[PDB]
Structure 1
Amino acid sequence: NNKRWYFTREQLENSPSRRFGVDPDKELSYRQQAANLLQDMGQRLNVSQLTINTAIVYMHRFYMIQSFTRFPGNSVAPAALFLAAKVEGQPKKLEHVIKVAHTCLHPQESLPDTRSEAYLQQVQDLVILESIILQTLGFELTIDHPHTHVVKCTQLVRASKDLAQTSYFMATNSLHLTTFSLQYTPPVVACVCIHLACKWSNWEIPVSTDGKHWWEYVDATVTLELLDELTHELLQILEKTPNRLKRIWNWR
C-alpha cells in the first residue's frame, strides 16, 4: 500500500521494541546509533550518501516490524548497507563489507582468519540477515530519494548556495536523528528542512505575488502550524547533538 510504511504517533509509541520493554528514549537512540554506523561504514566503503540514506530508511522500516531486543543495530546495519549498495548500483563485495563492519565495531580487535569457522559463520550470518530484511520489507526497496526534493525545493525558491547547502544539511540530519521519514512524505520533510534552514540563517521568503506561501507550491497538505511544530522538534534534537550545529553556525 501507499501508506503501509507511514505511521501515526500512536503506532510509533507501540513499536515492536516497546513491546519488549524498551523505553521510547532508548529506541530513538538505538536508531540514531544504527544511522551513525551506516554513515561511518558507508563513508569508508566509499559509497554515496544516497545509498547510505537508502540503508537508513530500510533500518527505520525494519524496526517498525522487528524488535531491537531480537535484532541488534550492530547486525542489521551492515546487512542493510550491503543490500542498499546492491539496490542502488554501487554493489560492495560481501567480504569487503564484513571487513569494514568489523573494524568500525572493533577498532582494536584483531581481524579473523578468513578461513576460520568463526568467519565463515559471520559471512553466512550477514546473508541470513539480509534475507530477513528483504522479507520484513516485503521486497519493497525502491525509496523516494529525499535530496532530489530539497534541491527542487530550495531552487523553486531561489536560495543562495549557503541556504541550499544548509537545507541539505537539515535533510540528512533529519534522517539520522528523527523518524520523520516514517511519518511524513519526502516532499513534506523537504519543506520542514527548508523552513528551518531559513529560520537558522535569518532568511525570509517573500509571499508569492498572490499571497500564497512558497510551500503550497510544493505540497497542498503542508501548513505553517505543522512546519513550526516539526522544525521545533528537529531543532531540539539538533541542539542535543554535540558539534552538529557547529557545522552550520556562522562563525564570522
Structure 2
Amino acid sequence: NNKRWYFTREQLENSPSRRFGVDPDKELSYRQQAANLLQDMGQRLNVSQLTINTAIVYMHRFYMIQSFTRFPGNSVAPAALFLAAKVEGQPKKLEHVIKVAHTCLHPQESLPDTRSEAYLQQVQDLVILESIILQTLGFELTIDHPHTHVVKCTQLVRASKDLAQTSYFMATNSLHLTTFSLQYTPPVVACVCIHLACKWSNWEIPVSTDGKHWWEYVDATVTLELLDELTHELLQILEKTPNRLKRIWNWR
C-alpha cells in the first residue's frame, strides 16, 4: 500500500513499544540513539549518508511493527546498516560490520577470537536479525529521501551554496531527530527543510510571477500552516541537541 508506512499521530502514540510500557519520550530517545549508532558505524565503515539514511528509515519502520523491549536498537542498527549497504550498492562484509559495531558499542572491550563460539554466535545473530528486518518490512527496501527533492527546490529558488548545504543538514537531522519519515512524504519533508533553512539564514523566497509560493511547485498538499507547524517541531528538537545547531550557526 501507498499509506502502509505512513502513520497518524494516534498510530504513533499506540506503538508496539508503548504496548510493552515504553513511554513516548523514551521511545523517541531510543530512535535517536539508533540513528546516532547508525551514523557512527556508517562513517567508520565509509558508507554514504544516503546508506545511513536508508538504514535509519529501516529502523524507524521496523519499530512501528516491533518493540524496543524485544529488539534493542544496539542489535537492530548493525543489521539495518548491513542490509542498507547491500541495497544501496555499497556492500560491506558481515565480519566488517560486526568488527565496527563492536568497537562503537564496546570501545574498551576487545573483539573475541573469530574462532570462538561467542563470535560465531554474534555473526549468526546479525544474519537472523537481517532476516527479521526484511520480513518486517515485507521486503520493501527502496527508500525515497527528502534530499532528492531538496535539489529540485534549491535550484527553483536559486539558493546559495550555503542555503542548499543548510537544507541537506535539515533533511538528515529530520531522520535522526524526528518521526517525519513515518508521517510525511519525502517532498513534504523537503519543503520543511528548505523553509527552516530560509528562516535560519534570513533568506526570503519571493512569490512567483503567477502569485504562487515556491512549495506549490513541489507539493500540492503543502500549506504554510503545516510548514510553520513542522519547522517549529524540527527547530525544538534541534535546540535540545547539544552542538547540532552550532554546525550551521553564523559565527561571523
For the residue of structure 2 that corresponds to 1:17, the secondary structure is: helix
Distance 2:19 2:77 in 1: 22
For the residue of structure 2 that corresponds to 1:205, the secondary structure is: coil
1:72-117 deviation digits (Å, cap 9, x = unpaired): 0000000000000001110000000000000000000011100000
Moved more, 169-178 or 149-158: 149-158
For the residue of structure 1 that corresponds to 2:34, the secondary structure is: helix
Distance 2:26 2:34 in 1: 12
Distance 1:95 1:191 in 2: 40
- Partner in structure 2 of residue 125 of structure 1: 125
1:155-181 deviation digits (Å, cap 9, x = unpaired): 111100001100001000001000000
For the residue of structure 2 that corresponds to 1:208, the secondary structure is: coil
- Partner in structure 2 of residue 215 of structure 1: 215
- After TM superposition, the runs of 4+ consecutive aligned structure 1 residues lying more than 6 A away are none
Gaps of 5+ in 2: none
Gaps of 5+ in 1: none
Distance 1:33 1:151 in 2: 28
1:250 deviates by 0.3
For the residue of structure 1 that corresponds to 2:16, the secondary structure is: coil
Distance 1:64 1:154 in 2: 32
Moved more, 219-228 or 205-214: 205-214
Distance 1:191 1:251 in 2: 26
1:147 deviates by 1.2
Distance 1:20 1:156 in 2: 46
1:191 deviates by 0.2
Distance 1:131 1:209 in 2: 52
- Partner in structure 2 of residue 27 of structure 1: 27
Distance 1:185 1:216 in 2: 15
Distance 2:53 2:103 in 1: 21
Distance 2:196 2:112 in 1: 46
1:153 deviates by 1.3
Q: CA RMSD in A?
A: 0.5
1:33 deviates by 0.2
1:1-42 deviation digits (Å, cap 9, x = unpaired): 011000000000000000000000000000000000000000
Identity of aligned residues (%): 100
1:35-56 deviation digits (Å, cap 9, x = unpaired): 0000000000000000000000
1:172-213 deviation digits (Å, cap 9, x = unpaired): 000100000000000000000000000000001110012111
1:118-165 deviation digits (Å, cap 9, x = unpaired): 000000000000000000000000011321111111111110000110
Distance 2:207 2:19 in 1: 47
Distance 1:210 1:83 in 2: 46
Distance 2:104 2:233 in 1: 30
Distance 1:251 1:173 in 2: 21
